[PDB]
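#help-structures
NK: newbie question, is this the right format to request a structure? protein is Antibacterial protein FALL-39, core peptide
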Amino acid sequence: LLGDFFRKSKEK
C-alpha cells in the first residue's frame, strides 16, 4: 500500500 498513504493513512 502507498498511493493510499499520500491520500490518507486512515483519518484525514
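mod (FA): yep, format's fine, and the C-alpha cells are attached above. The helical segments are 3-7.
NK: thank you!
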